């Protein structure tokens, strides 16, 4: 019943972007400050958020034009990594500029074209600066060490950044032709050190060996199945009914101990002590499995057989109806390792290929959660280095490389569109403004000076705002992938132009 | 009466900041014979007249002296110079009364961190 | 930026005492006082010390701040 | 916009206005608080440390002050009011620097150099101790308790604490004292003079049938399970809807349990700790009587903390059924002792048990429950003083004198910084001196005189001397013999540092959806 | 509770309560009796030569009544 | 001069319970002392005139609680 | 009421709440002033709406009262401590302390060390007890010009039944000995 006119719907599109762009521009760049999420709508809690997805999703936007911005920044963060942060600011920086065009009363279609061809102008200038550093093996080793130093940064880590750096660089170079995105597994558990992250030689399942079971199984022959139990096992064609009063409620809870014995008779005929199942057990079934001589290994998954499939040479399979439909497992040694605070069984053997298992140590859940996404951002981007070894100068040095050339193309090529092409390039230089205050440097002396400086010579010289100075982006190692910077432009350019074509919001 | 006086005489001998700790304490003793005098309709001004007129500076000694007196009868509210009356309460009931009356002003001080709660 | 400006010559006082090397105001980027040639009389600066503490002394001189309706009227 | 600047100013101003009346600590200063809630609860308070623990605030920057006292209690256990008043001193400095026009980001790494020089200078004035020496561990824990409430309990509860740590700690270079090692129990019966330090694990289990195994003939059992029996964990083969049918399942229930309780008596395991996993109040009340007839010290649905120590101290792991003849992952005991002082109290002592090198236990007794509580908090604070020395062996002055003694020195090092952070830290280095003045400030009339006087005398005293903390006046507080560990202060340095830095990390306040 | 009333105002308030009771009953005294008429709060007339039947049925004031 | 002003007075009274020679405060030596031995001098008659004049005005104003005016 | 009411717990944070409780304590103390001593005035105090009592015993009054201030509260607590000792002397401790808690905040503020005013209170308390032990100037009842008879006759003259108490003097002398 509400048809909102263009003059407010355009204004809603801008204030929808400004009210969210300022939220994360603290956390952008080397992030001299953060964003502190405050929980009062759901519970009484406090969150330190450099993750934009924690900023975007946990604070649900009520501006419908801002809803487009959250969604398109979400998919960018999912595939490439670090996409909620970079896309949303650059879209918000464009829409501050577009108000001055509407203040000058520019055709909105000119603004649609003006950022679009300038986006084409920027990516070519971004492509000209894209240079290979993963060429030779010693180069490809030192290529990924500096990039993982950059991608794991702009987040909150105590000592984690250098050890998640040198671990993942070892994982990429061993495959030589693809990245490891197929069967490596991020295991997070309670640890005592805020620095440790080690690669597994083998793979691990959650099994705290208890009552009387042995600690090491040798000469493994694994029966892989999906049939299991938690506490319930009724008869095949029979049943037991014990309810006619209020005293039967206690006796129907006592019958769950005798249900656990019927499933043990099934595994006992096999004579296979290496039986894994997807379902869990308690202290009450575990006294019954190990007493028969056949050990039940719970908390299994598809991921364990898939990790066993690539290195050893087997296959991953499921739907346990007959045992020839699920591909079985073979191992040399089954040992229980103690990682962090947690005891897990570990099927150790052949390793080091298309499949690994990454275990994380930290007693704080908040430290473990931020370390997941920070490692999740790089492994795709380090796989993008396998796709394109072209790196580009991180920290906004590549940002000024595009603002240098688009501004030149904003003058010559158009005849009316120059006011719309310049609002692109001025918003490009707003990205060093939001980081210069974070290091404390004057934003006005930053954005024009170095843009002309490294473009006319020594493009390696860029923004070293871990000092508040100008530094070299290949000597100080502050460089990232050409692919990650290429993808965040198109998502930022489109979503602004989508809600700019919005000139009628109607609320039914 | 002498405790209002000869503690303040004792207070000056202590010197510094702790003097008015004793002096305001000994000043607050004066209202007890005063308000009982108003209840006895004697009204507090002959009561501060006589008791200061007794207390000798050259003879700060009480012993049984004909040069200073400290007694006062309360049922008339007027000082009848007596030492056999049933209006003069012993040591034991008084020394403990000096404790808790001192302690009550200390009792309000025992706060740390004045706050609110939602 | 004056906030940057107080930082630099403060480090120069860690470097060198009794400075002939203070800030510039010609934006030449050469912060001196003997090569920027910004030099004044010592009597004049010393007079400015006497005059500034005179005024704070002057407004402290009586304890009277009462008026009949007419002390600034 | 004006909105991020005004909230950061208000986030400072709200928690600081809370922290303004928190400068009312250190003894008798001010007027009492009968606090009425929004629900109307009568809250009569006199202790500012528990006030910080109970502190209900809705403002989220002030909600970090709650965790600031929680982190101070878990790290040092000393000066929970002291970490707040120095964090209120942090909120003093951050206002005018923004009014100067300094970035809040620059003030964040301004806090680093205050912390880095601060832990350095306090190290320079501190002197370490030797963590195998009974004397140096004794002189500091009592001196802190002499500044605290008890003074006659300081003579007895402190050497019990010194012998407590030496069981738990290794020789001198070691960091192993946890509050999750020593359990402080409560025993009605006996008194504070009747308290006892027991070497091993003492659990606070309520054990029925006093008159039980009191001897070395004992093993201990932590069971994650219960005894399998008909109408306990097995089943009855008839139905019950009648009172006459009810008696027939009661007879076959208690008959098989009698076969169960003798086999545990056969084992020599006289202790069974049952977790909180109920079926019918998990192990039967008929079953506990026959265990008591076999003199077995049992309880059901015991708390989680009792389970954690018995797995930690001796190493007791869950086993199979006693009909399945338990796999001897139960702990080997050399004393199961039921304790009865004046016929009251239910307590288990396990003396001479296995240990991982730690975990001594105390028996805190008392004639009333309040008589328990007076020595309970007193020996617990006596543990936390030496625990600071275990984690960091060094001696500084007690009473807040090194807070100002750091401040006299740091301003000189603030001049050597010569940065923009030189002006920021110096603005806080002057803010640290306020602790004798502002604690005195919230009382009565004639206000202008005393405040700056309480801070001149330290600056007149020196970098080496200042005002006394127990009688006042300029003297060496070490010659006044008032000591505290370094970790009392340097933890309060770091904990206050991160939080007010995190206030600088706040912008554009949000609420969840 | 916490309540304190300053002296003269209560002793005078004792006078105003008692004297007004003493007004009509002095004229209700003896063979020169008047009658103290209470109108009922639910309607209805009551007059006697005894104010105790009048006062105990009606709202008695606190201070001296 | 900068003092706890009342606590100075408490100090000067002890030196009048023990001495009582010239004990006052110094503003120019910034402490407590004998002001004749601190040489702060002025003739005694103007004090005697001040003691009479301060007593005269004080008893006079309290003697008037009834003041008559004429606005015509 | 003075001070802010937006905050909870009736907190006024400073000189107003220090001016609040000196009003809250004195009004408690003013009740005992009317009822002080044997000449003290009897107060008719309503219990709920119809139940009344007539007292000049201050401890009995404070049993009736329900405190709503800490200045109301701690005066009831300290007076009951003397009440379980004897029950006498409970009147004196209430009236004096209202002036004392006016005087204490002004000076414990003024610390070189804050307990010196409190120790000055205790030194004043101990200065009393020493001279309390030095008192034989007034109040001997262990003897008199004749005996305990001289103590008891003036004690039975203090309790009036007319001019009598002469024959009644010998009863009090016998009573500790009978």
Swiss-Prot record, chain D:
<dbReference type="InterPro" id="IPR027410">
    <property type="entry name" value="TCP-1-like_intermed_sf"/>
</dbReference>
<feature type="modified residue" description="N6-acetyllysine">
    <location>
        <position position="293"/>
    </location>
</feature>
<dbReference type="GO" id="GO:0006457">
    <property type="term" value="P:protein folding"/>
</dbReference>
<dbReference type="GO" id="GO:0005654">
    <property type="term" value="C:nucleoplasm"/>
</dbReference>
<dbReference type="InterPro" id="IPR012717">
    <property type="entry name" value="Chap_CCT_delta"/>
</dbReference>
<dbReference type="GO" id="GO:0061077">
    <property type="term" value="P:chaperone-mediated protein folding"/>
</dbReference>
<feature type="binding site">
    <location>
        <position position="27"/>
    </location>
    <ligand>
        <name>ATP</name>
    </ligand>
</feature>
<dbReference type="InterPro" id="IPR017998">
    <property type="entry name" value="Chaperone_TCP-1"/>
</dbReference>
<comment type="subunit">
    <text>Component of the chaperonin-containing T-complex (TRiC), a hexadecamer composed of two identical back-to-back stacked rings enclosing a protein folding chamber. Each ring is made up of eight different subunits: TCP1/CCT1, CCT2, CCT3, CCT4, CCT5, CCT6A/CCT6, CCT7, CCT8. Interacts with PACRG. Interacts with DNAAF4. Interacts with DLEC1.</text>
</comment>
<dbReference type="GO" id="GO:0051086">
    <property type="term" value="P:chaperone mediated protein folding independent of cofactor"/>
</dbReference>
<feature type="modified residue" description="Phosphoserine">
    <location>
        <position position="418"/>
    </location>
</feature>
<keyword id="KW-0963">Cytoplasm</keyword>
UniProtKB/Swiss-Prot annotation, chain E:
<comment type="function">
    <text>Component of the chaperonin-containing T-complex (TRiC), a molecular chaperone complex that assists the folding of actin, tubulin and other proteins upon ATP hydrolysis. The TRiC complex mediates the folding of WRAP53/TCAB1, thereby regulating telomere maintenance. As part of the TRiC complex may play a role in the assembly of BBSome, a complex involved in ciliogenesis regulating transports vesicles to the cilia.</text>
</comment>
<feature type="cross-link" description="Glycyl lysine isopeptide (Lys-Gly) (interchain with G-Cter in SUMO2)">
    <location>
        <position position="3"/>
    </location>
</feature>
<feature type="binding site">
    <location>
        <position position="30"/>
    </location>
    <ligand>
        <name>ATP</name>
    </ligand>
</feature>
<comment type="subunit">
    <text>Component of the chaperonin-containing T-complex (TRiC), a hexadecamer composed of two identical back-to-back stacked rings enclosing a protein folding chamber. Each ring is made up of eight different subunits: TCP1/CCT1, CCT2, CCT3, CCT4, CCT5, CCT6A/CCT6, CCT7, CCT8. Interacts with PACRG. Interacts with DNAAF4. Interacts with DLEC1.</text>
</comment>
<protein>
    <recommendedName>
        <fullName>T-complex protein 1 subunit gamma</fullName>
    </recommendedName>
</protein>
<feature type="binding site">
    <location>
        <position position="30"/>
    </location>
    <ligand>
        <name>ADP</name>
    </ligand>
</feature>
<comment type="similarity">
    <text>Belongs to the TCP-1 chaperonin family.</text>
</comment>
Curated annotation (Swiss-Prot), chain F:
<feature type="binding site">
    <location>
        <position position="42"/>
    </location>
    <ligand>
        <name>ADP</name>
    </ligand>
</feature>
<feature type="binding site">
    <location>
        <position position="47"/>
    </location>
    <ligand>
        <name>ATP</name>
    </ligand>
</feature>
<comment type="similarity">
    <text>Belongs to the TCP-1 chaperonin family.</text>
</comment>
<comment type="function">
    <text>Component of the chaperonin-containing T-complex (TRiC), a molecular chaperone complex that assists the folding of actin, tubulin and other proteins upon ATP hydrolysis. The TRiC complex mediates the folding of WRAP53/TCAB1, thereby regulating telomere maintenance.</text>
</comment>
<comment type="subunit">
    <text>Component of the chaperonin-containing T-complex (TRiC), a hexadecamer composed of two identical back-to-back stacked rings enclosing a protein folding chamber. Each ring is made up of eight different subunits: TCP1/CCT1, CCT2, CCT3, CCT4, CCT5, CCT6A/CCT6, CCT7, CCT8. Interacts with PACRG. Interacts with DLEC1.</text>
</comment>
<feature type="binding site">
    <location>
        <position position="47"/>
    </location>
    <ligand>
        <name>ADP</name>
    </ligand>
</feature>
<protein>
    <recommendedName>
        <fullName>T-complex protein 1 subunit eta</fullName>
    </recommendedName>
</protein>
From Swiss-Prot, chain G:
<feature type="binding site">
    <location>
        <position position="89"/>
    </location>
    <ligand>
        <name>ADP</name>
    </ligand>
</feature>
<comment type="function">
    <text>Component of the chaperonin-containing T-complex (TRiC), a molecular chaperone complex that assists the folding of actin, tubulin and other proteins upon ATP hydrolysis. The TRiC complex mediates the folding of WRAP53/TCAB1, thereby regulating telomere maintenance. As part of the TRiC complex may play a role in the assembly of BBSome, a complex involved in ciliogenesis regulating transports vesicles to the cilia.</text>
</comment>
<feature type="binding site">
    <location>
        <position position="37"/>
    </location>
    <ligand>
        <name>ATP</name>
    </ligand>
</feature>
<feature type="binding site">
    <location>
        <position position="159"/>
    </location>
    <ligand>
        <name>ADP</name>
    </ligand>
</feature>
<feature type="modified residue" description="Phosphoserine">
    <location>
        <position position="6"/>
    </location>
</feature>
<feature type="binding site">
    <location>
        <position position="91"/>
    </location>
    <ligand>
        <name>ADP</name>
    </ligand>
</feature>
<feature type="binding site">
    <location>
        <position position="90"/>
    </location>
    <ligand>
        <name>ATP</name>
    </ligand>
</feature>
<feature type="modified residue" description="N-acetylmethionine">
    <location>
        <position position="1"/>
    </location>
</feature>
<protein>
    <recommendedName>
        <fullName>T-complex protein 1 subunit alpha</fullName>
    </recommendedName>
</protein>
<feature type="binding site">
    <location>
        <position position="92"/>
    </location>
    <ligand>
        <name>ADP</name>
    </ligand>
</feature>
<feature type="binding site">
    <location>
        <position position="91"/>
    </location>
    <ligand>
        <name>ATP</name>
    </ligand>
</feature>
<feature type="binding site">
    <location>
        <position position="158"/>
    </location>
    <ligand>
        <name>ADP</name>
    </ligand>
</feature>
């Amino acid at each position: 019943a509400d048809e909102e006119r263009a003059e407010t719907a355009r204004l809603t599109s801008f204030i929808g972007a400004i009210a969210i762009g300022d939220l994360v521009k603290s956390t952008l760049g080397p992030k001299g400050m953060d964003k502190i999420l405050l929980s009062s709508g759901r519970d009484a809690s406090l969150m330190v958020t450099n993750d934009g997805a924690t900023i975007l999703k946990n604070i649900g936007v009520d501006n419908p034009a801002a809803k487009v911005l959250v969604d398109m920044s979400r998919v960018q963060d999912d595939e490439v990594g670090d996409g909620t942060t970079s896309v949303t600011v650059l879209a918000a920086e464009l829409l501050r500029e577009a108000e001055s065009l509407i203040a000058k009363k520019i055709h909105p279609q000119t603004i649609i074209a003006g950022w679009r061809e300038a986006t084409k102008a920027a990516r070519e200038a971004l492509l000209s600066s894209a240079v290979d550093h993963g060429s030779d093996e010693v180069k490809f080793r030192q290529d990924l060490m500096n990039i993982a130093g950059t991608t794991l940064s702009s987040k909150l880590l105590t000592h984690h950044k250098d050890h998640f750096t040198k671990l993942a660089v070892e994982a990429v170079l061993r495959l030589k032709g693809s990245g490891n995105l197929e069967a490596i597994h991020i295991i997070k558990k309670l640890g005592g050190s805020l620095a440790d992250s080690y690669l597994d030689e083998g793979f691990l399942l959650d099994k705290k060996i208890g009552v009387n079971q042995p600690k090491r199984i040798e000469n493994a022959k694994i029966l892989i199945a999906n049939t299991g139990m938690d506490t319930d096992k009724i008869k095949i064609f029979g049943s037991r009914v014990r309810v006619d009063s209020t005293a039967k409620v206690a006796e129907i809870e006592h019958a769950e101990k005798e249900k656990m014995k019927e499933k043990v008779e099934r595994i006992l005929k096999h004579g296979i002590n290496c039986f894994i199942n997807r379902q869990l057990i308690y202290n009450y079934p575990e006294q019954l499995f190990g007493a028969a001589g056949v050990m039940a290994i719970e908390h299994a998954d598809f991921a364990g057989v898939e990790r066993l499939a690539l290195v050893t040479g087997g296959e991953i399979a499921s739907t346990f109806d007959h045992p020839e439909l699920v591909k079985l497992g073979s191992c040399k040694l089954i040992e229980e390792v103690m990682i962090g605070e947690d005891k897990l069984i570990h099927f150790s053997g052949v390793a080091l290929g298309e499949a690994c298992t990454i275990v994380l140590r930290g007693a704080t859940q908040q430290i473990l959660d931020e370390a997941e996404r920070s490692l999740h951002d790089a492994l795709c981007v380090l796989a993008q280095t396998v796709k394109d070894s072209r790196t580009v100068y991180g920290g906004g040095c590549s940002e000024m490389l595009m603002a240098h050339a688009v501004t030149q193309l904003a003058n010559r090529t158009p005849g009316k569109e120059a006011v719309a092409m310049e609002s692109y390039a001025k918003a490009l230089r707003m990205l060093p403004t939001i980081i210069a205050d974070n290091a404390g440097y004057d934003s006005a002396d930053l954005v024009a000076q170095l843009r002309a400086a490294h473009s006319e010579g020594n493009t390696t010289a860029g923004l070293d705002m871990r000092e508040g100075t100008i530094g070299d982006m290949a000597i100080l190692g502050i460089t990232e992938s050409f692919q990650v910077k290429r993808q965040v432009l198109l998502s930022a350019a489109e979503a602004a132009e989508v809600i700019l074509r919005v000139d009628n919001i109607i609320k039914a | 009466a002498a405790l209002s006086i000869y503690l303040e005489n004792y207070a000056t001998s202590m010197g510094s900041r702790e003097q008015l700790a004793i002096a305001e304490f000994a000043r607050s003793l004066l209202v007890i014979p005063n308000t009982l005098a108003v209840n006895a309709a004697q009204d507090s001004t002959d009561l501060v007249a006589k008791l200061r007129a007794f207390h000798n500076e050259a003879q700060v000694n009480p012993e049984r002296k004909n040069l200073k007196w400290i007694g006062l009868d309360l049922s008339n509210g007027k000082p009848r110079d007596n030492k056999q009356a049933g209006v003069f309460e012993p040591t034991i009931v008084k020394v403990k009364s000096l404790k808790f009356a001192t302690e009550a002003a200390i009792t309000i001080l025992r706060i740390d961190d004045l706050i609110k709660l939602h | 930026n004056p906030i940057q400006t107080m930082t630099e010559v403060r480090a120069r006082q860690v470097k060198e005492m009794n400075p002939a090397l203070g800030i510039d105001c010609l934006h030449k980027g050469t912060n001196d006082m003997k090569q920027q040639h910004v030099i004044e009389t010592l009597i004049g600066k010393k007079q400015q010390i006497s005059l500034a503490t005179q005024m704070v002394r002057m407004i402290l001189k009586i304890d009277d701040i009462r008026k009949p309706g007419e002390s600034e009227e | 916009r004006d909105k991020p600047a005004q909230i950061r100013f208000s986030n400072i101003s709200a928690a600081k206005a809370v922290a303004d009346a928190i400068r009312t600590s250190l003894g008798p200063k001010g007027m009492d608080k009968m606090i009425q809630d929004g629900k109307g609860d009568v809250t009569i308070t006199n202790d500012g440390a528990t006030i910080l623990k109970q502190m209900q605030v809705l403002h989220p920057a002030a909600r970090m002050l709650v965790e600031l006292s929680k982190a101070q209690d878990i790290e040092a256990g000393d000066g929970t009011t002291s970490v707040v008043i120095i964090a209120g001193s942090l909120l003093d400095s951050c206002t005018k620097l923004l009014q100067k026009g300094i970035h809040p980001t620059i003030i964040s790494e301004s806090f680093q150099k205050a912390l880095e020089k601060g832990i350095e200078i306090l190290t320079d004035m501190s002197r370490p101790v030797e963590l195998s020496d009974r004397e140096t561990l004794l002189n500091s824990a009592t001196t802190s308790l002499n500044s605290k409430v008890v003074s006659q309990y300081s003579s007895l509860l402190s050497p019990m604490s010194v012998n407590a740590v030496m069981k738990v700690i290794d020789p001198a270079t070691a960091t192993s004292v946890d509050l999750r090692d020593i359990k402080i129990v409560k025993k009605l019966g006996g008194t504070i003079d009747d308290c006892e330090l027991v070497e091993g694990l003492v659990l606070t289990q309520k054990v029925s049938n006093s008159g039980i195994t009191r001897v070395e003939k004992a093993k201990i059992g932590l069971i994650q399970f219960c005894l399998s029996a008909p109408k306990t964990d097995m089943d009855n083969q008839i139905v019950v809807s009648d009172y006459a049918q009810m008696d027939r399942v009661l007879r076959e229930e208690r008959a098989y349990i009698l076969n169960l309780v003798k086999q545990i008596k056969k084992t020599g395991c006289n202790v069974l700790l049952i977790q909180k996993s109920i079926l019918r109040d998990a192990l039967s009340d008929l079953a506990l009587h026959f265990l008591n007839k076999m003199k077995i010290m049992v309880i059901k649905d015991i708390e989680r903390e009792d389970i954690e120590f018995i797995c930690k101290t001796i190493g007791t792991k869950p086993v199979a059924h006693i009909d399945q003849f338990t796999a001897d992952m139960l702990g080997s005991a050399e004393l199961a002792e039921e304790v009865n002082l004046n016929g009251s109290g239910k307590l288990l002592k396990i003396t001479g048990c296995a240990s991982p090198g730690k975990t001594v236990t105390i028996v805190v007794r008392g004639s009333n429950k309040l008589v328990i509580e007076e020595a309970e908090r007193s020996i617990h604070d006596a543990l936390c003083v030496i625990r600071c020395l275990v984690k960091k062996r060094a001696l500084i002055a007690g009473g807040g004198a090194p807070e100002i003694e750091l401040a006299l020195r740091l301003t000189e090092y603030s001049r050597t910084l010569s940065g923009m952070e030189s002006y920021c830290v110096r603005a806080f280095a002057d803010a640290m001196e306020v602790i004798p003045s502002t604690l005195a400030e919230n009382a009565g009339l004639n206000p202008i005189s005393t405040v700056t006087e309480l801070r001149n005398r330290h600056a007149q005293g020196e970098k080496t001397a200042g005002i006394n903390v127990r009688k006042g006046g300029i003297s060496n507080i070490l010659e006044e013999l008032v000591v505290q560990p370094l970790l009392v202060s340097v933890s309060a340095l770091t904990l206050a540092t991160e939080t007010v830095r995190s206030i600088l990390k706040i912008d554009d306040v949000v609420n969840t959806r | 509770n916490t309540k304190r009333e300053s002296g003269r105002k209560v002793q005078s308030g004792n006078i105003n309560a008692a004297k007004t009771i003493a007004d009509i009953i002095r004229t209700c005294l003896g063979p020169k009796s008047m009658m103290k008429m209470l109108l009922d709060p639910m309607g209805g007339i009551v007059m006697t030569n005894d104010g105790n039947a009048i006062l105990r049925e009606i709202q008695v004031q606190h201070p001296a009544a | 001069a900068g003092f706890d002003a009342t606590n100075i007075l408490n100090k000067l009274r002890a030196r009048h319970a023990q001495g009582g020679t010239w004990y006052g405060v110094d503003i120019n030596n910034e402490d407590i002392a004998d002001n004749f031995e601190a040489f702060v001098w002025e003739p005694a008659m103007v004090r005697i005139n001040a003691l009479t004049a301060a007593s005269e005005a004080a008893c006079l104003i309290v003697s008037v609680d009834e003041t008559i005016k004429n606005p015509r | 009421m003075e001070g802010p009411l937006s905050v909870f717990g009736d907190r006024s944070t400073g000189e107003t709440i220090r001016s609040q409780n000196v009003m809250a304590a004195a009004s408690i103390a003013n009740i005992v002033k009317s009822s002080l001593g044997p000449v003290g005035l009897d107060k008719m105090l309503v219990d709920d709406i119809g139940d009344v009592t007539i007292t000049n015993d201050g401890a009995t009054i404070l049993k009736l009262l329900e405190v709503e201030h800490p200045a109301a509260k701690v005066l009831c607590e300290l007076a009951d401590l003397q009440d379980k000792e004897v029950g006498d002397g409970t009147t004196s401790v209430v009236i004096i302390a209202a002036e004392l808690l006016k005087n204490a905040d002004e000076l414990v503020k003024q610390k070189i060390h804050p307990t010196s005013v409190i120790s000055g209170y205790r030194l004043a308390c101990k200065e009393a007890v020493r001279y309390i032990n030095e008192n034989l100037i007034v109040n001997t009842d262990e003897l008199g010009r004749d005996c305990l008879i001289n103590a008891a006759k003036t004690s039975m003259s203090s309790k009036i039944i007319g001019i009598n108490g002469d024959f009644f003097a010998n009863m009090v002398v016998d009573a500790v000995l009978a």
